[PDB]
Structure 1
Amino acid sequence: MPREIITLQLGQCGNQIGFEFWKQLCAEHGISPEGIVEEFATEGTDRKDVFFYQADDEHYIPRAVLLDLEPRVIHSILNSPYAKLYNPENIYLSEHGGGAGNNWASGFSQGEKIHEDIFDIIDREADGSDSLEGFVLCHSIAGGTGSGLGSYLLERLNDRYPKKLVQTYSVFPNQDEMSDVVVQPYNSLLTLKRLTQNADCVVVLDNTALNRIATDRLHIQNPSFSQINQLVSTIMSASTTTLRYPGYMNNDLIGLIASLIPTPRLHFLMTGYTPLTTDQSVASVRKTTVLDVMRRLLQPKNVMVSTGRDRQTNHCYIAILNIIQGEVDPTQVHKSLQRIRERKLANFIPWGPASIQVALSRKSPYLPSAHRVSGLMMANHTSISSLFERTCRQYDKLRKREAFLEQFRKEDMFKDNFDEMDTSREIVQQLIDEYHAATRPDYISWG
Structure 2
Amino acid sequence: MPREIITLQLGQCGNQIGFEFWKQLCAEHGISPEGIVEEFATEGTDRKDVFFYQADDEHYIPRAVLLDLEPRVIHSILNSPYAKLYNPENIYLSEHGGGAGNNWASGFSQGEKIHEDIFDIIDREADGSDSLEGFVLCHSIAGGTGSGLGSYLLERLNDRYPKKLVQTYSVFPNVVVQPYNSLLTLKRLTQNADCVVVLDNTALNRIATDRLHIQNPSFSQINQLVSTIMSASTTTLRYPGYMNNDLIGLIASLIPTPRLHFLMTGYTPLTTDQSVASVRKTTVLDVMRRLLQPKNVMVSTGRDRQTNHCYIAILNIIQGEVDPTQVHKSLQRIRERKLANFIPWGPASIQVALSRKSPYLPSAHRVSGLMMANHTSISSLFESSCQQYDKLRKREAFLEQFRKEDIFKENFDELDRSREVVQELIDEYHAATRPDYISWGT
Supply the distance in 2 between the matched residues of 1:373 and 1:301 (Cα, whole angstroms). Answer: 19
Distance in structure 2 (CA, Å) of the matches to 1:230 and 1:395: 30
Kindly state the Cα deviation for residue 352 of structure 1 after the two structures are TM-superposed.
3.4
- Aligned pairs for 1:169-188 (under 5 A) are 169-174=169-174, 181-188=175-182
Q: Distance in 2 between matches of 1:285 and 1:110?
A: 53
Q: Deviations over 1:309-368 (max 9, x none)?
A: 323211111332212221112343244335435643112233433242222322111112
Matched, 1:237 2:248: no
1:78-136 Cα offsets, whole Å, 9 max, x none, are 23333333221111111122222221211221121111111111122222222101211
Matches within 5 A, 1:162-311: 162-174=162-174, 181-281=175-275, 287-311=281-305
**What is the distance in 1 between the residues matched to 2:336 and 2:133?**
41
8 Å CA contact retained: 1:308, 1:387:
yes
The Cα of 1:225 is off from its aligned counterpart by 4.4
- Structure 2 distance, partners of 1:248, 1:49, is 18
Structure 1 residues 94 and 275 mapped into 2: Cα distance closer, same or farther (>3 Å)? same
In the aligned structure 2, how far is the partner of 1:115 from the partner of 1:9?
A: 15
Over 3 Å counting, the alpha-carbon distance change for 1:224 and 1:432 in structure 2 is: farther
Kindly tell me the number of residue pairs found equivalent between the two proteins. Answer: 441
SS in 1 for 2:343: coil
In the alignment, structure 2 segments of 5+ residues that lack a partner are none
Mark the CA change 1:89 to 1:378 in structure 2 (over 3 Å): closer, same or farther. same
Q: How far apart in 1 are the matches of 2:206 and 2:415?
A: 26
1:114-163 CA-partner distances (Å, limit 9, x unpaired):
11111111122222222101211111112122322222222221232133
- 2:207–2:270 contact (8 Å) kept in structure 1: no
Taking the aligned partners of 2:194 and 2:292, their CA distance within structure 1 comes to 29
- Tell me what 2:18 maps to: 18
- Whether the aligned pair in 2 keeps the contact of 1:250 and 1:359 (CA below 8 Å) is no
Q: 1:64 to 1:292 in 2, by over 3 A?
A: same
Aligned to 1:178: none
Alignment CA distance shift 1:338-1:433 (3 Å): same
**Structure 1, residues 353-407: CA drift from partner, whole Å, max 9, x if none?**
3242222322111112122122222222110111122112212212222333344
- C-alpha contact 2:25 2:231 (8 A) present in aligned 1: yes
SS at structure 2 position matched to 1:401: coil
CA offset at residue 423 of structure 1?
A: 2.1
- CA displacement at 1:171 relative to structure 2: 1.3
Call closer, same or farther: CA 1:311–1:357 in 2, change over 3 Å: closer
Deviation of 1:228 after TM superposition, in Å, equals 3.2
Query: What do the CA deviations read for 1:185-237 (whole angstroms, capped 9, x no partner)?
Result: 21121112222222222222222222222222233333344543442222111
Counterpart Cα distance in 1 of 2:332 and 2:352: 15
Contact 1:307 / 1:387 at 8 angstroms: preserved in 2?
yes
Deviation at 1:184, TM superposition (A): 2.0
Q: Tell me if structure 2 keeps the 8 A contact 1:271–1:378.
A: yes
> What TM-score, normalized by structure 2, do the two folds share?
0.92
CA contact (8 A) 2:64 2:90 kept: yes
Q: How many Å apart are 1:282 and its aligned residue?
A: 6.6
Cα offset, 1:290, TM superposition: 0.9
1:257-300 deviation digits (Å, cap 9, x = unpaired): 33222222222222222233324337878521111111211222
CA distance in structure 2 between the partners assigned to 1:40 and 1:435 by the alignment:
47
Query: Structure 2: how far apart are the matches of 1:318 and 1:214?
Result: 27
The percent identity for this pair of structures is 98
CA contact 1:66–1:90 (8 Å) conserved in 2 = yes
Indicate if the aligned counterparts of 1:322 and 1:359 stay in contact, CA closer than 8 A: yes
